[PDB]
Amino acid sequence: VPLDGGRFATSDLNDLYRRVINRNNRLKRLLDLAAPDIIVRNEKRMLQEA
Amino acid sequence: QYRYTLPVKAGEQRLLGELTGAACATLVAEIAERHAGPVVLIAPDMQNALRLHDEISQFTDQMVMNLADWETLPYDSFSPHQDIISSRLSTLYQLPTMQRGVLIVPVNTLMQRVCPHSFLHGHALVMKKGQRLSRDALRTQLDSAGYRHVDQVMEHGEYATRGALLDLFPMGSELPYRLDFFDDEIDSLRVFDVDSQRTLEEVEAINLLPAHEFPTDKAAIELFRSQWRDTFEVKRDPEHIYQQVSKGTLPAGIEYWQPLFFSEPLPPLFSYFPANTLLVNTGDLETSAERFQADTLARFENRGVDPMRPLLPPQSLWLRVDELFSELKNWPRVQLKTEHLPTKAANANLGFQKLPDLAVQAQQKAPLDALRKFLETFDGPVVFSVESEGRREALGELLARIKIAPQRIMRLDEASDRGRYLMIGAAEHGFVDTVRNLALICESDLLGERVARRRQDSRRTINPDTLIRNLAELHIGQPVVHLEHGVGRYAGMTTLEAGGITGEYLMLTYANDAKLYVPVSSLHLISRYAGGAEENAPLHKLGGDAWSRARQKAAEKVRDVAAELLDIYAQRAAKEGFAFKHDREQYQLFCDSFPFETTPDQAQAINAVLSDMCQPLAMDRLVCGDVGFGKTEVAMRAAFLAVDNHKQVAVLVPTTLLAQQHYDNFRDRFANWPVRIEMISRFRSAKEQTQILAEVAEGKIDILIGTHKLLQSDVKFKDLGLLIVDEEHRFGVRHKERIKAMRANVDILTLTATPIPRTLNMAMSGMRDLSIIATPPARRLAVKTFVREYDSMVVREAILREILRGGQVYYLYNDVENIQKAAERLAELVPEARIAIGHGQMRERELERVMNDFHHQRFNVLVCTTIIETGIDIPTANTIIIERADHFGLAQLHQLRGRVGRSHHQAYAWLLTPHPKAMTTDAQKRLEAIASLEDLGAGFALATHDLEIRGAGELLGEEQSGSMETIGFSLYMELLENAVDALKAGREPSLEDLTSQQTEVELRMPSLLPDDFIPDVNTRLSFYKRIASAKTENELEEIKVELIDRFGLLPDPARTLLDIARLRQQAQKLGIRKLEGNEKGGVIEFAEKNHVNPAWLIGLLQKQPQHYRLDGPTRLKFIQDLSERKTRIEWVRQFMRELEENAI
């Protein structure tokens, strides 16, 4: 919803879902790249945290 | 015949004096060459010892080695990187019996106690051809020794066992061996390389030394626990090293628990000396050993706390200096003193006096004045002793200036009665030997003194009728000029404080009553007003608008890029790529010419590059990965593949130094392959670059490495086929696109270490192919880092850690004004250092002077700004200390963290930060980002974490790494495919290609279609195409009215674009190849078969030379203060409209 000043309300669920989608897309690309284990390990850790 | 007598007795001395630098080397050289018995030279400090390890080789062919010190302080907290140990104890095996040769030991490792011969002799063994020794029996023997079983043996202490075939790397030797055990017996002793993996040759017998300097097995661990529970106490903790070795694992600082593992007092290694052994001393041991013991005791009492890891008493692990100077009296000693000892027996003062100052300077007309005078008046032999053979050329032409060509002799004894001789080594200070009248004139004897001076006393003509003679009788209020600030009103005497002192000063009230005081001592900075207007003088403001003038802003997108990069990518996607051919054995030959073997990660990257490079698609590939991982050989193989098709590879690197490195690397690799390669940058003269460009245009050059001199609209490749950008960061956007604009289907290949977030994101979205690389080829030991609040003692201990190891320190201050102060501040903190400065604003000759001093270890600590980001990496530099890790790019931090190492020496990288509340939040995030992900292969992870910190910049524009809310990926792909369709449809030429048809109409003004006026970019690009393609004015205003119809009235940039094209039309008609107008004027350049009237140009020049000046037949520099671009347009339009009548 907008705050009448050209912006929109935060709607925290959108922020959490945005974090999850960002992290999941990053992990998907890193799996498509056959990336080394430490970086994909860190990304899976941060996905789980998200 | 000799000059002195060798001493052989219990504790007698032989005192040799009058010696000066780089003569101790030749004395001990003749000592080695004249004496039967090993010579152990005991240097006053390891630093000096390292220097001596060079010079002795220069003067003798006799065998030399050092005893490797653990590179940590007493009671430090680091394992010595067991590689070092592999050298160390190896000498301890041969030290029992070595008849000749020299061993150089500093006092530090001289006084350390060492493991007894019981352990080393017992746990050593021999393997011969004919032992009936079983396979797993020998494996268990290796286990009891304490080696490590890995299948990929590369470094020391490593073994593999696979069925019948066994291999191991003994800690004493230098090469591994393969065994091939059959019927439970040795059958082969085959040396196979760490890189070839194939048997070089077959020996019959070889020796094996144990794991490291103390035993490790379970009986020894039980002995260790027994002796700990005897002396110290125990506390249950998984970090307490008692229980931590009860778990079996050896801690970091365990080597300082030497005597506990051994059940007997440790020998002081003098037993390790042979019976008939002579010692030579340099400097004064009585001071250096005592200072080291005092440092050890101070560091012990500092660390003799923290009962979690308590410590030993030094009176067992280290010798005491009284014990040292008693135990010395069982070995004869020769003391080399740099001082005139008066007289006694066993004491001879050898005349080895100083050379006179042969200083070379170009300020005098004759540079080699002192040299040419000294050598001719000299009566004996002179030797020059150049460091490197290339530097020998630096000899040859300089001695050609007085026409001197010397002889090349190996040994110093090859000097004759009189002459000029040269040789190779590392000595640094020549001398004159009075006994044989020898002269040695080293490299640094002609380049002696470093100079630092800029300018002084410009307008100091203190006798002008306006200086007022500093009479101090001036009435208050009379205006006064101060040379640094300006004109104001004097306002009398005043009394102030400046931090606890009183002072009297001169009040000067400048404009807006900003008071200024200067002391009465510096009255010579004051003059009376010289304009004669003491009742009419103006009033300046102090210092001027330093930051107030910075409120300007704007300069509206001088030229938009969102309608250019889309065009470039459209040209890329529309045309297909080029087809390459790879031939298996042909390219395999180039694989064989590489004298190494690739990692699996390198194999993956090479497979990807070769596969996508052979295909008819356009490569766009990152080879991201940490520094020192072998990325260059990838692009090197790719360049070979391209040049096999003769397709003119172009490497592009962001500095002349990297350009030089890639130039000589590619030339040395392709020395056997028939190909031409060169570098191009500012170091190439214009007289040479004009040749290089023509050679490239005809296509005689297959590889052109160079810096941004490429993207200067002047190179014209006959057929470009492969761009190789190296170090992608520090190339902004449009630097990587000025080259792509020339040929649409170039196979990009972009190496880096840490990509900028825009290119990392646009790799992460499938637009750019990516190929991460890890697993460095050699075992490559990582660089420990630390994050500390800045502390004057942690910096001091780090600096002495690196100095007493024997290596340089990169102090990174990142400032030019205060670095001069920081030099003496660091010198006061660390007296034991040899500190000097180097920064980018030096005169660029002193800078390379300091660098070439730094390669030769003439001074340890280099306080320096981020010029070392490029790096000229040496072997000894092995500790970088960032003074302010608060504000730095994360990519920069990683890159400087990679600048150290490149050796077997374990490096360090401190990152000193300010108070944790003082640093910004982004500074915090950068600091845990660099602190946490510390391992091998952290190059990619750091850039991945840099993304989402700064955010990927706008995809279709310039300005990488920005958090802007611009167009998304979905819209960008839509725009690209729409551009592909509209391009492939009707015959529509490229934008930049018709820039070939364009004339240079630069005016330094906003001339474009603004994005507010036209939101969509593809219609904007279509209007660019239709504007620039149109050839008549009626077509131009047709487009103008069509803009009126679709989007209404024109902004000023749009109408300037239209009348610029209007100018372009009859500019091409008149042959005007180039014209530039600006605020103050400009220059107009026409063709040669042009219509410029000679009579009319003569009329203009002779009627207005101040506003028209031909410099050449066609280059007309006009000087006209066109303040408004409106006036600019009117002047140029009316000028060329008057020209078209004179057009004949």
Ligand SMILES: Nc1ncnc2c1ncn2[C@@H]1O[C@H](COP(=O)(O)OP(=O)(O)O)[C@@H](O)[C@H]1O
């Ligand atoms: N198989 C190998 N064996 C030994 N050294 C290697 C091997 N591969 C690469 N190297 C070394 O690694 C370095 C390669 O670094 P390079 O790719 O030139 O730049 P960067 O340091 O950015 O990776 C070279 O100095 C080379 O000697």
Ligand SMILES: [Mg+2]
């Ligand atoms: Mg490189």
